[PDB]
């Protein structure tokens, strides 16, 4: 997740990310967001809810 | 492009270990669903190791069960395949084969070069 996203995921009310399967990492970066409504997270290849 | 060269093929006696390599290409080896073949003198190409995207799922020919083990390993685009203790039958042509393409332009499939090995 890029650091521009989270610094405008402040007031974000939806947000999607389509990976087309490829790992995605988040590492403690998903708490800056508060706003958020909507969380798609296609094909992100998670493999494990992220805290 | 989209290409692969095989290496590791050489000739060995009987008993020992060989690990064959793959060089690829712009394709994912995480991606890219990866066969590697052989053709044998006097006989025709037949599959030996398919390692799978998306689970690393390993499919073998009965001939071939039991003493071959095929990976793909990232961050350095490489399909490897192990044989430990090979029969004098191993003696062939082997080729890397991609049937699936990276995720995106989806390319044609391309057979690999290929290393002859001989088992005495």
């Known amino acids: 997740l890029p650091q521009v996203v989270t610094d405008v995921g402040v007031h974000l009310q939806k947000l999607s990310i389509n990976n087309e399967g490829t790992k995605l990492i988040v590492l403690n970066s998903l708490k800056k967001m508060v706003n958020l409504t909507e969380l798609e997270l296609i094909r992100c290849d998670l493999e494990r809810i992220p805290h | ?120």
Not at chain 2, 1 to 24: D, F, I, K, T
Request: with cysteine.
């Open chain 2, 1 to 120: 492009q989209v290409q692969l060269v095989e290496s590791g093929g050489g000739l060995v006696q009987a008993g020992g270990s060989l690990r064959l390599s793959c060089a690829a290409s712009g394709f994912p080896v995480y991606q890219a669903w990866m066969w590697w073949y052989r053709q044998a003198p006097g006989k025709e190409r037949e599959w030996v190791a398919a390692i799978e995207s998306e689970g690393q799922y390993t499919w073998y020919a009965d001939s071939v069960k039991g003493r071959f083990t095929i990976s793909r390993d990232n961050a350095k685009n490489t399909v490897y395949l192990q044989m430990n203790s090979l029969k004098p039958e191993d003696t062939a042509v082997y080729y890397c084969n991609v049937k699936d393409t990276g995720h995106t332009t989806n390319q044609y499939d391309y057979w690999g070069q290929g290393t002859q090995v001989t088992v005495s």
